[PDB]
Design a protein around this nucleic acid. Structure first.
Ligand SMILES: [Mg+2]
Ligand SMILES: [Mg+2]
Ligand SMILES: [Mg+2]
Ligand SMILES: [Mg+2]
Ligand SMILES: [Mg+2]
Ligand SMILES: [Mg+2]
Ligand SMILES: [Mg+2]
Ligand SMILES: [Mg+2]
Ligand SMILES: [Mg+2]
Ligand SMILES: [Mg+2]
Ligand SMILES: [Mg+2]
Ligand SMILES: [Mg+2]
Ligand SMILES: [Mg+2]
Ligand SMILES: [Mg+2]
Ligand SMILES: [Mg+2]
Ligand SMILES: [Mg+2]
Ligand SMILES: [Mg+2]
Ligand SMILES: [Mg+2]
Ligand SMILES: [Mg+2]
Ligand SMILES: [Mg+2]
Ligand SMILES: [Mg+2]
Ligand SMILES: [Mg+2]
Ligand SMILES: [Mg+2]
Ligand SMILES: [Mg+2]
Ligand SMILES: [Mg+2]
Ligand SMILES: [Mg+2]
Ligand SMILES: [Mg+2]
Ligand SMILES: [Mg+2]
Ligand SMILES: [Mg+2]
Ligand SMILES: [Mg+2]
Ligand SMILES: [Mg+2]
Ligand SMILES: [Mg+2]
Ligand SMILES: [Mg+2]
Ligand SMILES: [Mg+2]
Ligand SMILES: [Mg+2]
Ligand SMILES: [Mg+2]
Ligand SMILES: [Mg+2]
Ligand SMILES: [Mg+2]
Ligand SMILES: [Mg+2]
Ligand SMILES: [Mg+2]
Ligand SMILES: [Mg+2]
Ligand SMILES: [Mg+2]
Ligand SMILES: [Mg+2]
Ligand SMILES: [Mg+2]
Ligand SMILES: [Mg+2]
Ligand SMILES: [Mg+2]
Ligand SMILES: [Mg+2]
Ligand SMILES: [Mg+2]
Ligand SMILES: [Mg+2]
Ligand SMILES: [Mg+2]
Ligand SMILES: [Mg+2]
Ligand SMILES: [Mg+2]
Ligand SMILES: [Mg+2]
Ligand SMILES: [Mg+2]
Ligand SMILES: [Mg+2]
Ligand SMILES: [Mg+2]
Ligand SMILES: [Mg+2]
Ligand SMILES: [Mg+2]
Ligand SMILES: [Mg+2]
Ligand SMILES: [Mg+2]
Ligand SMILES: [Mg+2]
Ligand SMILES: [Mg+2]
Ligand SMILES: [Mg+2]
Ligand SMILES: [Mg+2]
Ligand SMILES: [Mg+2]
Ligand SMILES: [Mg+2]
Ligand SMILES: [Mg+2]
Ligand SMILES: [Mg+2]
Ligand SMILES: [Mg+2]
Ligand SMILES: [Mg+2]
Ligand SMILES: [Mg+2]
Ligand SMILES: [Mg+2]
Ligand SMILES: [Mg+2]
Ligand SMILES: [Mg+2]
Ligand SMILES: [Mg+2]
Ligand SMILES: [Mg+2]
Ligand SMILES: [Mg+2]
Ligand SMILES: [Mg+2]
Ligand SMILES: [Mg+2]
Ligand SMILES: [Mg+2]
Ligand SMILES: [Mg+2]
Ligand SMILES: [Mg+2]
Ligand SMILES: [Mg+2]
Ligand SMILES: [Mg+2]
Ligand SMILES: [Mg+2]
Ligand SMILES: [Mg+2]
Ligand SMILES: [Mg+2]
Ligand SMILES: [Mg+2]
Ligand SMILES: [Mg+2]
Ligand SMILES: [Mg+2]
Ligand SMILES: [Mg+2]
Ligand SMILES: [Mg+2]
Ligand SMILES: [Mg+2]
Ligand SMILES: [Mg+2]
Ligand SMILES: [Mg+2]
Length: 248
RNA sequence: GGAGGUGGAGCACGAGCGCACGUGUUAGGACCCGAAAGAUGGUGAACUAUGCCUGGGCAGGGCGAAGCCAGAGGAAACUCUGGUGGAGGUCCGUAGCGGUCCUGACGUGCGAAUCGGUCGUCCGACCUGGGUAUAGGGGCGAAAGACUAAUCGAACCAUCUAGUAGCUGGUUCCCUCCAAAGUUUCCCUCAGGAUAGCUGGCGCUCUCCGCAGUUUUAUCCGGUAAAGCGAAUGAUUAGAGG
RNA sequence: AGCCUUGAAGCCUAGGGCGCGGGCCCGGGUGGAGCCGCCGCAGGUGCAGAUCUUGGUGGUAGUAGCAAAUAUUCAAACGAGAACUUUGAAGGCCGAAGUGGAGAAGGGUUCCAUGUGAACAGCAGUUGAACAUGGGUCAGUCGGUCCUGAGAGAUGGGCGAGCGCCGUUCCGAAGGGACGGGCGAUGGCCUCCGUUGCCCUCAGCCGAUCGAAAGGGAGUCGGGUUCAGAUCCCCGAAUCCG
RNA sequence: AGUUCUCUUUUCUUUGUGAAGGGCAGGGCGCCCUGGAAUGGGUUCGCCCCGAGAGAGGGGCCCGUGCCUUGGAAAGCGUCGCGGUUCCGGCGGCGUCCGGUGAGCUCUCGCUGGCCCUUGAAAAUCCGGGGGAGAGGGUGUAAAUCUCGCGCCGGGCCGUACCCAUAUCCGCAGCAGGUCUCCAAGGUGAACAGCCUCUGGCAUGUUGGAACAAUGUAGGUAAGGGAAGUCGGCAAGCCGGAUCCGUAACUUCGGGAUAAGGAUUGGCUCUAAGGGCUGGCAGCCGACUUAGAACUGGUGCGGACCAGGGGAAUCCGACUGUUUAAUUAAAACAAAGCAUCGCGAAGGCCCGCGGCGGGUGUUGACGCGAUGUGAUUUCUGCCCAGUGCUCUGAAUGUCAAAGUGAAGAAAUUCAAUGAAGCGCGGGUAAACGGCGGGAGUAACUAUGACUCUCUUAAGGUAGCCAAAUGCCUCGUCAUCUAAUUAGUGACGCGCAUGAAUGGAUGAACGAGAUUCCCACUGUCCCUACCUACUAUCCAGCGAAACCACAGCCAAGGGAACGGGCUUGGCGGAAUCAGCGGGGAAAGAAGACCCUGUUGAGCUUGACUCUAGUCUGGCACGGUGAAGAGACGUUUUUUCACUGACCCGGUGAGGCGGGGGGGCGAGCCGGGCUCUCGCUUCUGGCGCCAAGCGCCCGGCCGGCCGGGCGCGACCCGCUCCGGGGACAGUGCCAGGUGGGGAGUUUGACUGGGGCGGUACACCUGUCAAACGGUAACGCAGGUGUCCUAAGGCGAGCUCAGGGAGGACAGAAACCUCCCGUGGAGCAGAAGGGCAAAAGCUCGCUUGAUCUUGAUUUUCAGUACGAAUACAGACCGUGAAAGCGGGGCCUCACGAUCCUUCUGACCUUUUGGGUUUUAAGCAGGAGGUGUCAGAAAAGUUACCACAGGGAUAACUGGCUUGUGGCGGCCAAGCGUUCAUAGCGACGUCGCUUUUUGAUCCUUCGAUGUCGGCUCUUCCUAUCAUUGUGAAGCAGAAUUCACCAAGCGUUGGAUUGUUCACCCACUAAUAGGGAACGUGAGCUGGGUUUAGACCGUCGUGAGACAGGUUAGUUUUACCCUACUGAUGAUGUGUUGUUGCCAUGGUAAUCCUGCUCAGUACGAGAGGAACCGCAGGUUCAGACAUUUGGUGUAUGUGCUUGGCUGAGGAG
């Protein structure tokens, strides 16, 4: 046989991200003395569309505490922030929408977005449009907090991780039918070469496990074991179940 | 050490070595030409496939979305009527792009895919220039095993390599003499081999008793032709007497 | 003690013969420089075939054909020669999405003048993009040149048997610069200002380099001029940069 | 300048001003000032704007490519006129003027809006601003400084011609192909449409002349009919613009829609309405529209060009989009929608030989990755047994290495322990997939709601159906026709329908498949004519394919279809235009089929491996506490540590500890519990130190200039965090691993496959009286069985029958007699056997050890089996003897390897001892394809070498089957065998049926049917001439001579075949390579795409359905059709004969005979005559029709010649 489309995606080539017109990487501030002890003020200059991303991005500007400079930060835009607004990042920032605080100081039930997976990494979790994480509980003795991720999983993270109060803007995006193959063509022309997708049963056996046959049938169980070799791991990968999810 | 059997490519008063010539069998390119293949290392994205970058391009019409204005109706909700407006992977249709049917032309062509009419689409998932990226068990594929320089169910180039072929084709002067087999057995044996047979050549040991695809005379062997079933086995017709 | 310029090989021959034959001998002609008999030795040693190889030639055959896109005619000139060249006049066509006027890519002298009519231009040619002999491309301002784009690609580092590869800011002491000030050395319009070396002080850019004759990118227009070049030459009038 | 016969103050051409600077129009402003607005106003085509400041005034700025001006009239151009060397930027006159208009086109600037789950580059480079370190001079010849105006110097390098495409480029070429752009006139018109013209360009596309045959290619027309043609309306045709009216079912309410269906359209002369500027009015300007009316022509008017046929339905796919460049444009692919699955980053998925490697990822679950289905609507039932997937695990069978323990001299052996994975138990079908059978039963019959029963993991639910899915099948009913294998609607025990392998539906849409209808028509009846380009002849110029020799037939035989050969017919130069019968014509070593110990693509439950991956061990690999152990050491568990190792961030910017200061708490002003480190209202600013303390320098306490410290706490060993003795990596070990590699996937065979085993053996027969002898010949058997069923001895006699005997009988047990085997001897059969070879007892292990010879198969090899002996040990018998397996003929296995047994055995390499190992000899472990490889599929994407050794056509032999025909005569025919039939039997013929066979062809003979066209046969349907009837007539049946002439139009189907409708004298049957593809067509079959059902895990398959799928060459020879001609008659001509060959006419209707013959009646003829027609043939154009480029004459559209006229 030949290498299947899934295998070919990992080699880069025509399968790399379309990053020509993106505005940069959306991150929190790099943690420094100001955010470790107090807070720093910043002003929202612009809220911009980022190609390939549902959520808008905020362009916040801070004062450099050591030099005569202005620092431009590219934050994830929490819903409700506006241009000209003051945002504050640090340990002693106040619990307002758009402020960046360590999750340790946030009370139980706080809604956050752009939450650091590890302390200092500048924000990794709950960055998709409309999403957020909640704060469940703190363990001051071990300095660790329990949060609920948008997928529903619960995670124990360091209390020192920073995060933005509120939910990511641009929510409810998936509530609109696309209605058109052309509109889906434009959605992915800004992201990557993944569209349109050709079904496995519609290929020949040479380039897919499901291909071939005088009838368009899978011919083998579609739940494939977790340890299947690359080029064989297609279909429902390591599925715990199949069918309609009935109930909770 | 003896006696008697038995296994040995032995002894029993050498015959070998060297060289040359012929024939036969083989190993090698191996009598000559002939595969589909496989391997190593390289050259191609000037066609085409797909992603990206930067440019260019797409008459004239039809329908008439939202929004807006006015008039009328209504207790309210709101309703009706006339305009305005100009949406759309919207319709007719040009450029462009494409290529349905004629199963038309042509079919040693104008052309190793073209030509005519007729046709699809023509603001979009649109068309296109150049730059750039992906390279051969690899790419790329809105998926036809398609496309990857007229080459694709695995490109092209050189080498391995005079690849192997139980299979097809060919195999070059004269005369003289002799002259087959398509059968036995074994073989993943059935288009082929090995094997015995049939052939030829070289002789040698003798001769001027032996032998014979023949009969005769003796003597055995046999269970087919025929015949038998009022004899065994098997099959079978009819009466008759108890 | 072979033959041979008093004519070798080769080649041709309705010449004379020999041999069962493979073949050979002699005569005649052409040719022009070598060759053969016998005893042995040696072999890349004998062709009718292989859709054999290479070269040549037939019949087919003066045959298929020289039929896509409406179309030519009259007079004259040159000339050996005119359906096809040139001029004049008619009749037509392309009909501004052109059969018009200019470019990019590609070509590379095909451009221009004169000459030829051998070969080529599938008839002809007095003609041609053919052949021959000579010419022709002029810039601060039009492009390249510079920038970066998708991307390519060194060093540090890592990997690697190795040619090398990965990687492009990532495991790097990655700056050879600057207003100013201080110490000397020199000079010149030696007056006082330069230059230089060292020291002091200050210093993010964080990625070498490459990447577009359509992207970014200061600044040239009018008139004349050649056989062929001109926003380039000349005339006139301007402008940018240093 | 053109026209001027007439008219035209006419028609044509032409009628400038660059950059840069200045000035001004014009356009724009989300810019300012006054002011304060509802009776809200302003305002655009639309919008939109206002107390966050509208209207109204007055300003400011930006672009000004427009006009004036400097340039600049000197130049350029038009015209007229002079010179010269006359190849002069030659010289002069005049001119280069004044207005209008526009949804006009092209460009450009600007304003404002809509679209995006799309937001639409970077950098070089240039500029402004904030700040104020600094510098500049002391009142002047002023200084630093200047983005102001002039002036001075320089700008190197490379490209630059021309073509830019029916001839400069790529396709071998001056190739009808391909190849990126810019400018873009008048008329008609909606128009960058088509048609004509100006500017500019060209010479008809690599030749001309003359003809006007056939056949073509491309255009036209056609009376009457109108799809009857054909697989199919393919092709052509009808419709078409615009105005006005009008418009259904259905619908997702958007559509359908130009639905459908009508009317109108010219020319000319008018009327009305629709605006601008200036000073309810007056004046002057103007640009195209719309509507209405009269008049008018032979009803012709969208007059050319341009330009939708329509309707009713069914299937499929929602749509737009895409696709096999070069045979498939589709129902296939995609799609939005829907539903699953993995993953929280030390991660999922993937790449990579390699790493602190790489893509997703400039990412973070509203995401990325992997699948299925395929808009909407409605719904998506049951099954977890199978195969997958997944979850739990020391509770826990198997389980590698390593480690631990015991035995031993050690090698080694043994035990204990027990990772993953398998087993075990759950979940899961929008995972692959699946979703029964029999019988009885309701008061006629039929069904059978109901019941019984066997049964699976469910037993097919809602739906739907002879559907693209149903064999039977052309299902049945209805509708559509005259007639329908077609279509539609129903029915449904459905070979083999069915629910995201998605079921049912349904608007719009479709170069998708199908049916009907209206309209239209040359598709057809049934063909004709016309035009252009060929063909044709000529001048010039000029190939190629192909070729053993060649080129007339009949039959024969023959490699079974001859050009050659045999026997006959016969034969006459050289050629022209056509033609497609033949050359089993050319083209290409057949793609079908088979064989090959030849392949390749693909699959998997094939064999052997393998990357990756999961898992255990060892090493890197450390520190401390406890807990549990064992004997201060050491194994293990847990918790911690950091320093290896890893990850994240940062321009490695404030870390740890202490000091110092502020707010609270509290014990009796000080200590502590212990917290804090100065920024949260506003879309400002924020650095390059102020201040203080202490030192030093220069000049004359005063001026000038520096240094240090605090401000800005001190000390520290990892920059700061997060992990961490684990990740991870190196090397081993176990599992998984069609992701990937290599390879295999028997043979025989009346082709192969499927089926059988005729593959190793045995009996009888074949088999032809020695032996041997074949077939997928016939009838059978074998892969075992036996401690006795082997061995010996003795003693008996069996099957069957007859006759007797309590229960007792057909059959129990006892007795007598007969009994040649008719029984038994493991088994198949054949042979053999009677004091035995059978049966019963007694003793036993000759079924033991051993060397040779021989026989059978045979090669005179092996094995296997068997025969005689020989040497030992034995058994049995009194003994002679018999016995080393079975009464004989079958009952089985090499090398290599392993295992056992044997010897005071040999070797174990320098010697010795000992374990081990290897030798020698004899058994066993097995090769059944049985003289003995280790082995699954598919190919329709296919490949090579071959095969006519071998299948799919024709042809050949045969003729069972099919067809046709005789003979006998039981019967039938009321009677009567034979008018006409004819059983039981039997003899033939034919090769238009199917078989059987495999002779020819696999370096190719084009495979069904139709169409067209000719010919032949007779086994005769019709017609002519006849014979016989159970022949009265009429009608019919049987038979003869007989193939001259006929044998038709249609619906359904690809059809052959069939069925029906209709007409007819009749509607016979056949052959010619199942006549006929260089004759066509291509509907079917029979490539590659795709759908459904059944089958398969799958790739894939299906004499199962469905849809789309390239049809090449003649100019050669012959034959044929026509055309010149040739011999030889001295030449030549006119008129003729006819040898030979061809040959043709055919059937029916009406009237009369005649309502007659005949007949009871009903009905009902014939011959002769007359008048017509059908089919066919040969002509012809007077007539009617068709054509018509006489391009003949009118009409007429657009354009062009200034108009008229003429064109
Ligand atoms: Mg496919
Ligand atoms: Mg596969
Ligand atoms: Mg020999
Ligand atoms: Mg040899
Ligand atoms: Mg191989
Ligand atoms: Mg390219
Ligand atoms: Mg459209
Ligand atoms: Mg359209
Ligand atoms: Mg054709
Ligand atoms: Mg042709
Ligand atoms: Mg695209
Ligand atoms: Mg790769
Ligand atoms: Mg396929
Ligand atoms: Mg060879
Ligand atoms: Mg070879
Ligand atoms: Mg063979
Ligand atoms: Mg064998
Ligand atoms: Mg052979
Ligand atoms: Mg016998
Ligand atoms: Mg007999
Ligand atoms: Mg001769
Ligand atoms: Mg010489
Ligand atoms: Mg030699
Ligand atoms: Mg030769
Ligand atoms: Mg000719
Ligand atoms: Mg031509
Ligand atoms: Mg041009
Ligand atoms: Mg030109
Ligand atoms: Mg020529
Ligand atoms: Mg020239
Ligand atoms: Mg590199
Ligand atoms: Mg550069
Ligand atoms: Mg450039
Ligand atoms: Mg440029
Ligand atoms: Mg105002
Ligand atoms: Mg002048
Ligand atoms: Mg300032
Ligand atoms: Mg040029
Ligand atoms: Mg012409
Ligand atoms: Mg010409
Ligand atoms: Mg040409
Ligand atoms: Mg007609
Ligand atoms: Mg008519
Ligand atoms: Mg019909
Ligand atoms: Mg018909
Ligand atoms: Mg048609
Ligand atoms: Mg309709
Ligand atoms: Mg579709
Ligand atoms: Mg595509
Ligand atoms: Mg194709
Ligand atoms: Mg096509
Ligand atoms: Mg699924
Ligand atoms: Mg279901
Ligand atoms: Mg299960
Ligand atoms: Mg089923
Ligand atoms: Mg049902
Ligand atoms: Mg239906
Ligand atoms: Mg039906
Ligand atoms: Mg019909
Ligand atoms: Mg199904
Ligand atoms: Mg000629
Ligand atoms: Mg022949
Ligand atoms: Mg022929
Ligand atoms: Mg062949
Ligand atoms: Mg072949
Ligand atoms: Mg073989
Ligand atoms: Mg293979
Ligand atoms: Mg291969
Ligand atoms: Mg296996
Ligand atoms: Mg595998
Ligand atoms: Mg494989
Ligand atoms: Mg076979
Ligand atoms: Mg005999
Ligand atoms: Mg006895
Ligand atoms: Mg003995
Ligand atoms: Mg016995
Ligand atoms: Mg197939
Ligand atoms: Mg097949
Ligand atoms: Mg044969
Ligand atoms: Mg046959
Ligand atoms: Mg009778
Ligand atoms: Mg035979
Ligand atoms: Mg042949
Ligand atoms: Mg033929
Ligand atoms: Mg042929
Ligand atoms: Mg007859
Ligand atoms: Mg035939
Ligand atoms: Mg033929
Ligand atoms: Mg044909
Ligand atoms: Mg077909
Ligand atoms: Mg097919
Ligand atoms: Mg299945
Ligand atoms: Mg009477
Ligand atoms: Mg007439
Ligand atoms: Mg006129």
């Amino acid at each position: 046989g030949r290498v299947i489309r899934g295998q070919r995606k990992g080699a880069g080539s025509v399968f790399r991200a379309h990053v020509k017109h993106r505005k940069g990487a959306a991150r929190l501030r790099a943690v420094d003395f100001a955010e470790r002890h107090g807070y720093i003020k910043g002003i929202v200059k612009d809220i911009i569309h980022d190609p390939g991303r549902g959520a808008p991005l905020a362009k916040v500007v801070f004062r450099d505490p050591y030099r005569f400079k202005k620092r431009t930060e590219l934050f994830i835009a929490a819903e409700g922030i506006h241009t000209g607004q003051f945002v504050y990042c640090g340990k002693k920032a106040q619990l307002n929408i758009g402020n960046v605080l360590p999750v340790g100081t946030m009370p139980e039930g706080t809604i956050v977005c752009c939450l650091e997976e590890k302390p200092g990494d500048r924000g990794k979790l709950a960055r998709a449009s409309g999403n957020y994480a909640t704060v469940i509980s703190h363990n001051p003795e071990t300095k660790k907090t329990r949060v609920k991720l948008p997928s529903g999983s619960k995670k124990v993270i360091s209390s020192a991780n920073r995060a933005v109060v509120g939910v990511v803007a641009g929510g409810g995006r998936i509530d609109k039918p696309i209605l058109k193959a052309g509109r889906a063509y434009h959605k992915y022309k800004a992201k990557r070469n993944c569209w349109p997708r050709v079904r496995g049963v519609a290929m020949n056996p040479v380039e897919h496990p499901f291909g071939g046959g005088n009838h368009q049938h899978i011919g083998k169980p579609s739940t494939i074991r977790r340890d299947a070799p690359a080029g064989r791991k297609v279909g429902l990968i390591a599925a715990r179940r199949t069918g309609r999810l009935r109930g909770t």
